[PDB]
Design a protein around this ligand. Structure first.
Ligand SMILES: Nc1ncnc2c1ncn2[C@@H]1O[C@H](COP(=O)(O)OP(=O)(O)OP(=O)(O)O)[C@@H](O)[C@H]1O
Ligand SMILES: Nc1ncnc2c1ncn2[C@@H]1O[C@H](COP(=O)(O)OP(=O)(O)O)[C@@H](O)[C@H]1O
Ligand SMILES: [Mg+2]
Ligand SMILES: [Mg+2]
Lengths: 523, 542
């Protein structure tokens, strides 16, 4: 049946109309007697053809945009993924057990958007911006799209400001620039979340000492986590006071995979408010490896062809178009920044996984957290030979940069002589020196949870370790030795080190002097 | 005016169907969507069969309604080519994305063309010196060759491609094209700003003295943009090769992203997937792009492509397909990188067509093959050494393990582009020095030196310098006891005299959050559109 031959059937060629007029006088009375069984016809609204697996097929919706929030009449939102010739495939931001065939779908006229602004600051929302903390609606807020394109080449500048984390291992070894993206990659239960939580608590501690434009407003995106974990984290952020500056977006493990796929984009749209108006944002996507699993669920339920491990093939684009919005803008665009901490859980240390090597080739560095260092109690279990941050380097604290090159070199030689002698019987007594210095330093860098340190109290603490001043202390009492050093050093030198930026030679003189009248517990 | 202006039939992600009621556009033709928020170009991919063409969007399709007017331009995507493109940044469709004004077009060429013919080919093998020890020794580059850097997300192929830019693209007096395909936007800004600093790119009225032109399709772009931006950079390089008639340097960061973008697109085009997940047309799409990147009889293109390997998997179909298109394949390994050896070049996996004694001379070739023989012999010994230790080896085996550790460390090199984060200044090692030094370490002239004297040095003069210095520092570890410049009266104030000079800051107490924020009035009911397009509350019925 050729379309050349179906085009000639538009022209009338009946040559007799003895039942055109017969039914055209009878069609309307026969249609009228079945009006109880007619659903009202649908053109600009939609009617659900078929719902299942969290994807509805919607008849009608003649004027929906691709990628648009639609609203089912039961109040559940959706997103028009693929407009087809006969239907619209929408993706249900919620459970599809409340959508029926024959339900009405309403176009809302706007591509998928979340409330951004100053009024979402402090709140706990779901993956689409509705609050779940129970304290009412989002007020002092405005709507903005979740799938904004990242800024281009000319809209950026290089990262210069040093974004202190409060972790001695991070701020000394793997330092973070302020528009940077740093992957926190590790196994299960290796302190991945703890580094990001410490960064958020430290931004609370630093926001009350900086003048209104060097403040960092954190966003925690919890994708695929438990809801009790998120409740405990909101309790911690509230009691430390860090919820004054934090937005908390959560699409937990019970939630639909569209909400878990969309929640990092919602949190990124909320933090891009602070990037776009000249302020600085911190965003933590906790388990981006669970957003990838939710997107794989959505793709295999859409019957898209699986690729490597089962992943859709655009699971690189999923995270790249996410993390590229973490930028440092130029001075013509306000100079705001957005620092990202994607978190990727790794299975048994396999860094050569698909999603892991995807996010490694997106982010500017990595923070590797090992199970063999975490089981030994070296916490944070930062793999110093593998962790790296090249964009934040030569953009860190200048006193910490003066001190920490010796620390990186001494931990490098400690790794060398532990790579040579994993059993202790052959002691050079200069290899014993680098072993004792490395064991002193790796006791120095390990710290406790939920208490981040200011950068001058880390600079002085690693100054007292990369030099002498701690070789009296043996290997155990270093955790009390550095606390005695922070306690017994006259606290003016912390003000001079914070204000000047680096250790001046007068301050180096007073610092060598002040580290001699310190009562070390190893005596 | 209605005919040859068709309408959007169905929108599936990066893939748009447009129905034309008469005289369909050709495959590869460019189509413009009217009324989009941005400029949306659609490249025709297939004719679906019912007056419908199947298109690839060069930008986002968020906002496409299923009746939207789509205008055929009658020609493929044409980008500005010429000397006026030098110093500018272009995107996939040839627009300036550097805010310097419109691009001075000597011509506008379509980005789709055939490869040069078999008669047009060039068979000339002269070496390209890169100043890198492992590259010049074991897999030397050809001056009109396709060069591939194979790597696995974090092994150093952007740092290698930047060091090759710094070493090669200044002595090489032609024009450069940097086609950034699917990489970080931060890295494009880094390269752009460092080229403005070193004067390779000149702004304003000095723009004609620029030497490099940048084409960028970075990893925030949609899959249709990253699938065609390599063809845009190729078109800019092919103008300089075919019309200006001169040598071009084309650097393509991650030509894998071209294949990955076509693999994202190919799912929605209704194709049965090939191996691991890829399009059935991997070899032919990749070969049609790669066979345009050649030197012909009228000009030269020295090509350096970074190639990503997907899960450190060199048997994945995209790296395994692109291996056969290159003259020199430098394979970077993660196990080499984890030993601190940088550049992390696997010396027993990096090959060239130039490692041939009739091309490089028998001295170079014999040194390179002897180095590879020692390294392969150590690789065969490593399974014994890991279990039984080096105490079970022969004395011949201990000699080859010691020599192979020395030539493993000697292949590493500091880069000038790595010195901003390593701190060690980089060394350009000449090829004659590379051959002589590696021959000396082969014959046993430098068995007196330790292993770490060879690590991260330029040439064999610096091994002996570092070996004197490491030995020299084996004694000198003290006498920083007194006689300081840091006692209390040297030039020192008191601590409270230091406190008063601190510029006290005023902490503003109000966060500056509602400076000019226009809060819209969010409705506590979902506002939707009814059948007449009017905004109404959501009706209270299920
Ligand atoms: N720096 C630290 N010092 C002491 N204990 C720590 C430290 N970091 C984490 N821990 C402890 O280790 C446990 C794991 O921490 P955390 O939840 O941060 O790891 P995780 O990587 O998030 O694991 P998962 O992703 O499975 O939740 C926690 O119970 C915490 O109390
Ligand atoms: N020659 C080198 N010297 C020192 N470090 C290097 C070198 N090459 C690579 N690296 C390290 O490897 C990391 C990843 O390299 P990069 O080229 O950015 O990765 P990719 O190969 O994914 O592009 C860099 O951040 C750098 O720290
Ligand atoms: Mg966790
Ligand atoms: Mg790269």
């Amino acid at each position: 049946a050729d379309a050349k031959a179906l085009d000639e059937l538009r022209k009338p060629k009946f040559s007799s109309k003895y039942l055109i007029q017969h039914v055209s006088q009878k069609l309307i009375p026969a249609v009228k007697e079945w009006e109880k069984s007619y659903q009202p016809p649908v053109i600009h609204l939609g009617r659900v053809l078929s719902v299942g697996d969290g994807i509805a097929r919607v008849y009608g919706l003649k004027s929906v945009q691709a990628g648009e929030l639609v609203c089912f009449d039961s109040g559940v939102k959706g997103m028009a993924l693929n407009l087809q010739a006969d239907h619209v495939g929408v993706v249900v931001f919620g459970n599809d057990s409340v959508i029926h065939q024959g339900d009405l779908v309403y176009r809302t006229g706007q591509i998928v958007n979340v409330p951004i602004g100053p009024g979402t600051l402090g709140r706990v929302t779901d993956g689409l911006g509705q609050p779940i903390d129970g304290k009412g609606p989002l007020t002092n807020v405005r709507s903005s799209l979740v799938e904004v394109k990242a800024p281009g080449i000319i809209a950026r500048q290089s990262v210069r400001e040093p974004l202190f984390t409060g972790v001695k291992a991070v701020d000394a070894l793997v330092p973070i620039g302020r528009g940077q993206r740093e992957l926190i990659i590790g196994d299960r239960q290796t302190g991945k979340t703890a580094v990001a939580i410490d960064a958020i608590i430290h931004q609370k501690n630093c926001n009350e000492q900086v003048p209104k434009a060097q403040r960092v407003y954190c966003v925690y995106v919890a994708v695929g986590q438990k809801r009790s974990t998120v409740a405990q984290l909101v309790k911690l952020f509230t009691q430390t006071g860090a919820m004054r500056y934090t937005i908390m977006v959560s699409a937990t493990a019970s939630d639909a995979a569209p909400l878990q796929f969309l929640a990092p984009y919602s949190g990124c749209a909320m933090a891009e408010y602070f990037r776009d108006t000249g302020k600085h944002g911190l965003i933590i996507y906790d388990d981006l490896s669970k957003q990838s699993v939710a997107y794989r669920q959505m793709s295999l339920l859409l019957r898209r062809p699986p690729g490597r491990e089962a992943f859709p093939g655009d699971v690189f684009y999923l995270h790249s178009r996410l993390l590229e919005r973490a930028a440092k803008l130029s001075k013509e665009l306000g100079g705001g920044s957005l620092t990202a901490f994607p978190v990727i859980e790794t299975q048994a240390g396999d860094v050569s996984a698909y999603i892991a090597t995807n996010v490694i080739s997106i982010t500017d560095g990595q923070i590797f957290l090992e199970t063999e260092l975490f089981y030994k109690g070296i916490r944070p279990a930062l793999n110093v030979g593998l962790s790296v941050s090249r964009v934040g380097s030569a953009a860190q604290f200048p006193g910490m940069k003066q001190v920490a090159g010796t620390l990186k070199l001494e931990l490098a030689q400690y790794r060398e002589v532990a790579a040579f002698a994993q059993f202790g019987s052959d002691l050079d007594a200069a290899t014993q020196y680098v072993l004792e210095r490395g064991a002193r330093l790796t006791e120095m860098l390990k710290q406790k949870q939920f208490a981040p340190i200011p950068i001058e109290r880390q600079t002085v603490a690693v100054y007292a370790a990369t030099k002498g001043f701690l070789d009296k202390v043996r290997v155990q009492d270093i955790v009390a030795a550095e606390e005695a050093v922070i306690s017994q050093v006259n606290p003016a030198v912390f003000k001079i080190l914070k204000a000047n930026g680096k250790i001046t030679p007068a301050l180096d003189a007073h610092l060598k002097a002040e580290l001699r009248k310190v009562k070390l517990p190893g005596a | 005016p209605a005919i040859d202006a068709g309408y959007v039939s169905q929108v599936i992600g990066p893939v748009v169907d447009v129905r034309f009621d008469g005289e369909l556009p050709s495959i590869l033709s460019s189509l413009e969507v009217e009324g989009h928020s941005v400029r949306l170009v659609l490249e025709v991919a297939q004719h679906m069969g019912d007056n419908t063409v199947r298109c690839i969007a060069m930008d986002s399709t968020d906002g496409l309604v299923r009746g939207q007017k789509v205008v055929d331009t009658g020609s493929p995507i044409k980008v500005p080519v010429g000397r006026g493109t030098l110093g500018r940044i272009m995107n996939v469709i040839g627009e300036p994305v550097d805010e310097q004004g419109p691009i001075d077009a000597a011509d506008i060429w379509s980005i789709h063309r055939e490869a040069p013919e078999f008669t047009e080919q060039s068979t000339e093998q002269e070496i390209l010196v890169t100043g890198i020890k492992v590259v010049d020794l074991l897999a030397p580059y050809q001056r009109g060759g396709k060069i591939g850097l194979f790597g696995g997300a974090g092994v150093g192929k952007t740092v290698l491609i930047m060091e090759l830019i710094n070493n090669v693209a200044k002595a090489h007096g032609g024009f450069s094209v940097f086609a950034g395909v699917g990489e970080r936007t931060r890295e494009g800004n880094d390269l752009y700003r460092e080229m403005i600093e070193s004067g390779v790119i000149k702004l304003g009225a000095e723009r004609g003295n620029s030497k490099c032109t940048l084409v960028y399709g970075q990893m925030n772009e949609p899959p249709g943009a990253r699938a065609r931006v390599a063809l845009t950079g190729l078109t800019v390089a092919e103008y300089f090769r075919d019309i200006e008639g001169q040598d071009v340097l084309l650097f393509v960061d991650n030509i894998f992203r071209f294949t990955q973008a076509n693999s994202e697109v190919s799912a929605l085009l209704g194709r049965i997937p090939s191996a691991v997940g890829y399009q059935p047309t991997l070899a032919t799409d990749l070969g049609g792009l790669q066979e345009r990147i050649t030197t012909t009889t009228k000009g030269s293109i020295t090509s350096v492509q970074a190639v990503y390997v997907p899960a450190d998997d060199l048997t994945d179909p995209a790296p395994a397909t692109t291996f056969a298109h290159l003259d020199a394949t430098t394979v970077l390994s993660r196990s080499i990188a984890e030993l601190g050896i940088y550049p992390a070049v696997d010396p027993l996996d990096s090959t060239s067509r130039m490692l041939n004694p009739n091309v490089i001379g028998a001295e170079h070739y014999n040194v390179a093959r002897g180095v590879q023989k020692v390294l392969q012999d150590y690789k065969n010994l490593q399974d014994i050494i890991a279990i039984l230790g080096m105490d079970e080896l022969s004395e011949e085996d201990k000699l080859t393990v010691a020599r192979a550790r020395k030539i493993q460390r000697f292949l590493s090199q500091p880069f000038q582009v790595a010195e901003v984060f390593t701190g060690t200044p980089g060394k350009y090692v000449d090829l004659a020095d590379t051959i002589s030094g590696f021959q000396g370490v082969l014959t046993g002239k430098y068995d007196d030196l330790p292993e770490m004297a060879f690590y991260m040095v330029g040439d064999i003069k610096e091994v002996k310098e570092k070996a004197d210095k490491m030995a020299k520092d084996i004694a000198s570890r003290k006498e920083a006891d007194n006689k300081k410049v840091s006692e209390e009266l040297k030039d020192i104030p008191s601590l409270d005299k230091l406190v008063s000079e601190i510029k006290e800051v005023v902490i503003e107490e109000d966060d500056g959050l509602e400076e000019d924020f226009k809060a819209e009035a969010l409705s506590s009911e979902t506002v939707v559109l009814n059948e007449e397009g009017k905004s109404v509350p959501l009706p209270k019925k299920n």
